[PDB]
Enzyme design. Structure first.
Site, PDB file in Angstrom:
ATOM      1  N   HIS A   1       0.807  -1.212   0.000  1.00  0.00           N
ATOM      2  CA  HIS A   1       0.000   0.000   0.000  1.00  0.00           C
ATOM      3  C   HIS A   1       0.844   1.267   0.000  1.00  0.00           C
ATOM      4  O   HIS A   1       0.295   2.364   0.139  1.00  0.00           O
ATOM      5  CB  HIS A   1      -0.955   0.001   1.197  1.00  0.00           C
ATOM      6  CG  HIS A   1      -0.366   0.576   2.448  1.00  0.00           C
ATOM      7  ND1 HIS A   1       0.486  -0.133   3.266  1.00  0.00           N
ATOM      8  CD2 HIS A   1      -0.520   1.790   3.028  1.00  0.00           C
ATOM      9  CE1 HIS A   1       0.839   0.620   4.292  1.00  0.00           C
ATOM     10  NE2 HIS A   1       0.243   1.793   4.170  1.00  0.00           N
TER      11      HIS A   1
ATOM     12  N   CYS B   1       4.421   1.710   9.390  1.00  0.00           N
ATOM     13  CA  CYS B   1       4.118   0.552   8.563  1.00  0.00           C
ATOM     14  C   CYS B   1       5.399  -0.025   7.981  1.00  0.00           C
ATOM     15  O   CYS B   1       6.343   0.704   7.660  1.00  0.00           O
ATOM     16  CB  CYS B   1       3.151   0.936   7.444  1.00  0.00           C
ATOM     17  SG  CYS B   1       1.661   1.762   8.021  1.00  0.00           S
TER      18      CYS B   1
ATOM     19  N   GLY C   1       3.548   6.142   9.534  1.00  0.00           N
ATOM     20  CA  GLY C   1       4.869   5.885   9.006  1.00  0.00           C
ATOM     21  C   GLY C   1       5.576   4.694   9.615  1.00  0.00           C
ATOM     22  O   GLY C   1       6.671   4.344   9.158  1.00  0.00           O
TER      23      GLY C   1
END
EC number: 3.4.19.12
Lengths: 305, 305
Positions: A41, A145, A143
């Site tokens: 993503h 992720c 952030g």
């Protein structure tokens, strides 16, 4: 003596974190030899996460639009692929810091360590357990992720990559093959998590650590059977207790002289009549994030490479 | 979102741990450039710890009786000195893994990370706070002496080296200059620790994290002054609250709209009337091992080298 919630040493993992950029969004990545792993993503802007078609969006992306920054040095993406929910960003220079790694998919009720990162840099490490409903309860900001969950064996075992935070605040992610734990999908819609039940087998191992470390006022007078225990647990929302769980509890039973079923009887009265404002190992609640194997590792002090 | 007890990334420290042997006892050491730091009681056998004269025992030791094993490679001690309660074991090859380090003596009420080790190898990392009575509550086994406590700034700050475990189970140690925290001495005799009071300023920062993260049923209706608060705290055994503590709480007050004295009023009723079986941030007790600076680091996600 003593008992703490210990995380694994993070040195091997923190040499593998990279900064991955695609557009405005910046999240983390896992640098293994010559394949950079990060959530798919990243190719997605804020409006995209709503109803995104992932197969089409990568087609509109080329090899020159992902920036894999390893601290100072920047890498050049040379090939990309999508494995379920993950981008394999093949690069040119193979990482000299690649350890003995493994790819594992953990089962519910098991524990691992998380190296929370931002912009490819390590910010903290802590211990967590996978809930039965396939979520986790960590500390993830925007952030973070791409932060990875690992277990160190002389081998690292990566088992989790954080992807999204549910609107209930709990966290969800996949393994390094890109397969989610639970029914979750990487789009920004209301996704339902189920009934979160307490991990009974970890709780019983925590009690054994308490007896090893002294807190033992809960050693009761009654006994019970294994159907009698599971009947009480299902009412207090505790997962049923199996024979294989008893076999896993073998070494703790041998070291302490307390039979597995006798400890269950103590827990049964603990659940029915509370802890009464009295603590065990410094806590007023029943802890379910120490696996039986974990209690042995800390009370016997095994080390690693 | 979320809140966990995060330890600092251990990679820099775990490259500095060495195995130090002198006789039968094997404990850990800290390898900085060309000086190996380890507790001075390594020269001590089991009978020696009772009533040992340290100045005389080193005289009976020579440069060839300490074995500093760094994993596979072994070092050759070339010079030794005693700094209060520590051995500086000067060796020949200077460590290439030496980071930007610092030597600091923390104050009571401050938090750091511990890399528990055995035989010079890392086994776990966890977060702990120095108690006001200058002890800690960790997980230390036999042979874990020499394990270091650090804070990472792009600089590491070593502030603790574990030496002994008190007969009450709590742990005591020194700084990297060799000076103990508290009245303790490195001999095996009954040494008394004082009244352990709860760290009030850390508790108030923990409540602010709870409001940031949602748990806020404790936001009360009353107010109070700063003498009125400290009167209640001294009865519940909580350390008095100062103006400098309020100044340290400034950024948390600004971000949440809750005045420092208004949060104290909520705590005052919390102490007087309990938490009533209801949790804050997933705990049934008041947590005092998050400093105000710590809450900012996690809720804003600052990183490091």
């Amino acid at each position: 003596s003593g008992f703490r919630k210990m995380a694994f040493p993070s040195g091997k993992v923190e040499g593998c974190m990279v900064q991955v950029t695609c557009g405005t969004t910046t999240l983390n990545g896992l640098w293994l030899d010559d394949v950079v792993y990060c959530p798919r993503h990243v190719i997605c802007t804020s409006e995209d996460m709503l109803n995104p078609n992932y197969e089409d969006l990568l087609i509109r992306k080329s090899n020159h639009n992902f920036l894999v920054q390893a601290g100072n040095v920047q890498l050049r993406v040379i090939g990309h692929s999508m494995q379920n929910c993950v981008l394999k960003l093949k690069v040119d220079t193979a990482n000299p810091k690649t350890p003995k790694y493994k790819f594992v998919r953990i089962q519910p009720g098991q524990t691992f360590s998380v190296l929370a990162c931002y912009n490819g840099s390590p910010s903290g490490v802590y211990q967590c357990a996978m809930r039965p409903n396939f979520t986790i309860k960590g500390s993830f900001l925007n952030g973070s992720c791409g932060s990875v969950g690992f277990n160190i064996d002389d081998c690292v075992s990566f088992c989790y990559m954080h992807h999204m935070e549910l609107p209930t605040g709990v966290h969800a992610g996949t393994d390094l093959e890109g397969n989610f734990y639970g029914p979750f999908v990487d789009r920004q819609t209301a996704q339902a998590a189920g009934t979160d039940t307490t991990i009974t087998v970890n709780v019983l191992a925590w009690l054994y650590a308490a007896v090893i470390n002294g807190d033992r006022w809960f050693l009761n007078r009654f006994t019970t059977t294994l159907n009698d225990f599971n009947l009480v647990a299902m009412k207090y929302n505790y997962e049923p207790l199996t024979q294989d769980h008893v076999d896993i509890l073998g070494p703790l039973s041998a070291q302490t002289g307390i039979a597995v079923l006798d400890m269950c009887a103590s827990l049964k009265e603990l659940l029915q009549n509370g802890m009464n404002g009295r603590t065990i190992l410094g806590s007023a609640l029943l802890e379910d994030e120490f696996t039986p194997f974990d209690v042995v590792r800390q009370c016997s002090g095994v080390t690693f490479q």
